[PDB]
Amino acid sequence: GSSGSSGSGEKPFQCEECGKRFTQNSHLHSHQRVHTGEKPSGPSSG
């Protein structure tokens, strides 16, 4: 139940589904491919 995906790292560019860490953004944006599927055509609330 406790927090699962800890979003407390060093690098500024951190994922949202895995809160990973990366040096550049390109790596992150593209890295999001590992989470393919969820295609929200609209904005998110929380």
Site for Zn ion, rule CB under 5 A = 15, 18, 20
Cα separation, 36 vs 30, whole angstroms: 10
**Closer residue to Zn ion in complex, CB, 19/46:** 19
31 touches 15 (CB < 8 A)? yes
Nearest to 22 by CA among 37, 12, 32, 36: 12
Q: How far is the CB of 19 from Zn ion (least distance, A)?
A: 7
**Closer residue to Zn ion in complex, CB, 36/46:** 36
**Closer residue to Zn ion in complex, CB, 9/18:** 18
